[PDB]
Amino acid sequence: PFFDVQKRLGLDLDRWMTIQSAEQPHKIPGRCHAFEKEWIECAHGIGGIRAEKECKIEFDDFVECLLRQKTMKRLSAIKRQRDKLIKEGKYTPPPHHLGKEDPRP
Amino acid sequence: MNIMLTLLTNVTLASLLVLIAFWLPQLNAYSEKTSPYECGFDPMGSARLPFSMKFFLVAITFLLFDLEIALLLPLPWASQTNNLKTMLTMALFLLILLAASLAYEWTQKGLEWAE
Amino acid sequence: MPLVYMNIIMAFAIALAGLLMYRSHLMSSLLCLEGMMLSLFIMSTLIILNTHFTLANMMPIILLVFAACEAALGLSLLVMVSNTYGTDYVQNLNLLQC
Amino acid sequence: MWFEILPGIAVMAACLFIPGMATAHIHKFTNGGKEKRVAHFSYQWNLMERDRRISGVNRYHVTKGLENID
Amino acid sequence: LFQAEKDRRVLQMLRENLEEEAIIMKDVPDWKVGESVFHTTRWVTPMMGELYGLRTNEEILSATYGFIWYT
Amino acid sequence: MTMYIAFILSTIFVIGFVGFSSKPSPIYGGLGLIVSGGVGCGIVLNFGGSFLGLMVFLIYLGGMLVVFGYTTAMATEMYPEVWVSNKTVFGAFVSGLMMEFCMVYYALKEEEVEIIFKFNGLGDWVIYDTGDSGFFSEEAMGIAALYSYGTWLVIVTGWSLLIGVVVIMEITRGN
Amino acid sequence: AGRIASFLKNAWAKEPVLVASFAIGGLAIILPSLSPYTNYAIRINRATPYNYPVPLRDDGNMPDVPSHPQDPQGPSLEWLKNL
Amino acid sequence: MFMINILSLIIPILLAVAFLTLVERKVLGYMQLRKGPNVVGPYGLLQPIADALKLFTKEPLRPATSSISMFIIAPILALSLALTMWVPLPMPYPLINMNLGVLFMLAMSSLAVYSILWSGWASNSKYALIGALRAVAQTISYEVTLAIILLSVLLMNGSYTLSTLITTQEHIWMIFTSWPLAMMWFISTLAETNRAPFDLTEGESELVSGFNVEYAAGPFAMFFMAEYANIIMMNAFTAILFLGASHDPHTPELYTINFVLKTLALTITFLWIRASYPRFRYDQLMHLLWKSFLPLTLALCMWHISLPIMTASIPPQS
Amino acid sequence: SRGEYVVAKLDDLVNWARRSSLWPMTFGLACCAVEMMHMAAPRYDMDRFGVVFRASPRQSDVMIVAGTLTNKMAPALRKVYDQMPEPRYVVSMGSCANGGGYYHYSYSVVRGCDRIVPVDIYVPGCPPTAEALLYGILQLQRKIKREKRLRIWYRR
């Protein structure tokens, strides 16, 4: 089914391309390099069954970095509250959030 | 942003030229005038009938040889790598098989059109 | 997810349904196969660009190469079928039953 | 021719002169007169954006020298 | 110098967003101001939406498609 | 929010997919696939994939030219069908259009799990990275890595191409 | 000796295009392995600083690492100036 | 202000095409011991205006058997793509500065063939169908060789940016390094623009008018303008690729003048070639491209990959 | 009036454009077509007047009936005449095309091409010289110069 010729011969036929934290050209990092690094080092050598349970926090962080669902939910909630507050006139946006900011280098 | 404006301007100019050509002159269309042309006479059959392609085999090979271009176009960027020996070996290896594929179809009469 | 991801996924689904539902011409189904490949290319490229995974920037090119191989195979089979029957209709391919 | 072909060639050359000269003049007119900046990579775009931010008039080509460091 | 200025600009934008979020989300009963969505306590590179969420559309265009559209 | 350009491009992508999936005459199918390839090239360009989008556009242009030649050779009829010349083709086209409309509406006006998961929209600009460095294109570097990192991929791809040439010649032999 | 000579004469008489193509391809295949400047090309590729050189934390046991760019330690590109 | 630049690009190109028609007529006349147009205006300078006004005041006709949408779309696509091909050309500055200008031009050129194909098919006439199939054959003949020639030539440039070609040729023309590739590229551009001896799609002696036989009036004129604009654009691209003009950043008009004379010389070379030779058979064109051009192109691609490594002359800007 | 002046000037422009760009169909029948070729020859060089042969009837402005029109050929000539977009002109060249000529009493010859299509200019001769055909073409140009379509429309 899976004859690990690569591991027996130490060839690295396709293992250079399996993960995002593995030796990219010019040392260009992946957008979620640290989260995947943490999750891989948490789950290494303990087996797939345990990796799912004792490393669920790192995987949740990695998935949040990948898809950013919770961040978008928080931003949507904040903007909905902001729109609700302006429509009744209780809140006014600051000048630096309306295009009249003082830029810095 | 600029490229979309340029494309829109070009397409708009062409469409406006078509509109001017189609609405400015006087039109007198009748059946004899709008009929299909075959130099003096009515066509025997339809122009939608199957039209045999004698170069059908070269057309299939063009599909495979066109993707050779996709694999070879990043070559200018590949020449900037440190392991130049590996890149040169693989670049020369890829073209050699492309040359051998052409040689195989040539020697097996694949480039000659159907009779 | 972005809504563009849903758009590309529905493009794949529509092309798959178009392949699975057959009209008279064999050629139409090959175009649906090519459309599925195009949607796969677009989706994979978007995923790779978004996550900045540098090394899989070459993977869609391999996808395109094997897409060309598939298209050549399908066109060759269509050539033989049309040479046999003079038409690329699927209903002529009924010599073999279950 | 034979020199009567020349007027048409000259008209065509005059027509072909216009695009590049107009492009250069428009670039100079809309970039402070100094050859519109080229940003083929993200670092050049970052330089352009910083130049726009520190100009004070939201224009990258407005250049601040040593007179802006009091 | 560019790295130092980038750090300061990003931190200032995050602080301004935090203050505006504190003002806006006061009426929500169970909302923690500046609450992270990650279990880890290490620094996370801010997402584009987080920096420019409460700003004008022109700035968002310039930040997202400014370089790609520049020709 | 910002100009939703990629949303329009992806909607046109889906529209072209419906166009060639309702399966009119292969001429119009190829036209729809060309439109889809162009708008997909534009989509990929809008996220920074200039090379990949342009390359897929070029490849599909060549493929569709070959497909047009083959359609004229072996897929013609006396009256080629368009999207309005047949009840079945028109029904499929309208059904695809309204299915896409329903999905889009249910997607942006509320949050539902269509098939896989849900989403709210917010435009594509939110998920970007605002990374600021480099005298190169990361897409170009990753693609050029094929000749230094992907030796195995180059080997299998070249073998597959040569075998494909041999295969088409074997199939089209006849006898 | 003479068989290959006659074969090459016939090929030059009938298919000069293929003869030239094979000669150019063979030269392109074999010449790079005998060139002394291939290593120079590799070194030139290595000498291009695409990314920032991250400094090392000094621990008092690196005699071959400079403390300033103009210090004599580290790689030198003098060979490149005269190339 | 950018729309001003778009117009200052497109309108003079149309004027140049209009007067290129007259230049062709006069040059082919004088190579044939006659004069060509010299009555409509002094030295025939008013002939293109009369031709355009006659063509756009003449009745256009829809064939009864034609497919109307594609029939109308094809000339629009042709003219719009012909105009679009000019935007990345650096003269010395481009209207649109692209990282990949050469490959963009490749893709747009590949798309341009569909105007011919769709016009021929939608005309629903036998001669137009023959012309469209000949166009399919021509593209199959030239595309791969042209692309690999571009690859081999640009290997010495270091990127696909068109403006870098000026820097690459600061001291010498690229032709002095790749003249076999230059000859093959010249023949490939002759085939790509459907010009004699490869003017197979129109095929006037054999197919009467070929793909555009059904077309009349204004729509016909747009096909003509698209073809001539493509000729000028291809010659300008060849001039940029193989004949590098020295550019002074403080005086770009010198580069503009040098560029214009070189592209005019290349266009006149096309005109001369048309005046000199008979027409190929359209199977002979494919045999020429696949049995002679393709092997040399592959060998020279190998050679131009190996040469910068052997001589330590790899260009910058990965 | 102002409108009368405007339509007169527009007529002048359109007539100049049409008579300065006259494209005859590539169409000949007999002996006369040889003199047509000689009128296209370098000595006379009709292209210098703006006269270019075009094969497609869709792209042609004038038909020159140069040769005998037989009964078997008349439907084809009528077909190619009809397919010509307007404005279109017909020039009859030679005795055969004018009135039947030397085969006038034949059983298989149409006694003049004006039985099939309207004719604008009749060029006499058997064959007319290339110079005579050039004179006929210039006369057709002068006749086109006298058209007043827009004046007639304005006075309607």
Ligand SMILES: CCCCCCCCCCCCCCCCC[C@@H](O)O[C@H](CO[C@H](O)CCCCCCCCCCCCCCC)COP(=O)(O)OCC[N+](C)(C)C
């Ligand atoms: C070079 C690039 C730039 C070009 C710029 C110009 C672009 C021009 C585009 C093409 C339009 C001009 C064509 C010629 C003029 C238009 C004439 C015609 O198209 O319109 C007529 C429109 O007529 C309509 O069918 C009915 C007329 C009434 C319509 C009522 C619309 C609302 C009017 C309300 C009246 C009160 C005033 C409202 C306006 C302020 C229909 O003409 P028709 O006879 O078929 O065609 C024959 C053409 N001939 C006669 C010139 C040879």
Ligand SMILES: CCCCCCCCCCCCCCCCC[C@@H](O)O[C@H](CO[C@H](O)CCCCCCCCCCCCCCC)COP(=O)(O)OCC[N+](C)(C)C
């Ligand atoms: C056990 C039996 C062996 C023979 C039969 C095996 C059948 C399979 C075909 C060949 C086996 C594949 C083995 C080669 C795997 C490639 C990887 C390895 O060789 O290392 C490469 C060494 O490169 C070599 O040149 C590999 C190329 C040699 C193969 C090309 C020709 C042989 C293929 C023959 C079969 C293919 C089909 C038929 C074609 C004739 C790259 O190393 P390097 O670049 O240092 O460092 C990479 C790490 N970086 C990126 C961080 C720098």
Ligand SMILES: CCCCCCCCCCCCCCCCC[C@@H](O)O[C@H](CO[C@H](O)CCCCCCCCCCCCCCC)COP(=O)(O)OCC[N+](C)(C)C
């Ligand atoms: C700007 C874009 C939109 C407009 C598009 C059109 C572009 C402008 C048109 C260019 C006008 C030039 C034509 C003038 C050439 C006339 C040459 C002269 O010879 O004409 C003479 C007299 O002139 C003519 O009678 C009238 C010509 C001028 C027409 C009036 C001017 C109208 C201009 C209005 C412009 C409006 C355009 C449309 C705007 C929407 C008659 O002599 P002719 O018999 O030949 O020669 C005899 C041959 N020989 C010498 C060898 C013996």
Ligand SMILES: CCCCCCCC/C=C\CCCCCCCC(=O)O[C@H](COC(=O)CCCCCCC/C=C/CCCCCCCC)COP(=O)(O)OCCN
């Ligand atoms: C080691 C180099 C390899 C890589 C470099 C090559 C890259 C590209 C070149 C290869 C492309 C494929 C070419 C395939 C050759 C097909 C041969 C063939 O069958 O053609 C014969 C004709 O060709 C032959 O004569 C058969 C082979 C003859 C020998 C060809 C060259 C062999 C090697 C010669 C040079 C060797 C190296 C150069 C050294 C020069 C001496 C100093 C049939 O001709 P038709 O076109 O069908 O005839 C129609 C009209 N009668």
Ligand SMILES: CCCCCCCCCCC1=C(C)C(=O)C(OC)=C(OC)C1=O
């Ligand atoms: C381009 C050179 C000028 C060609 C002029 C067009 C000739 C049209 C007459 C047709 C014709 C041709 C072509 C012709 O070749 C010929 O001789 C057999 C005739 O017999 C008189 C003809 O009638």
Ligand code: SF4
């Ligand atoms: S008129 Fe005289 S020259 Fe002309 S075709 Fe008749 S017989 Fe021949």
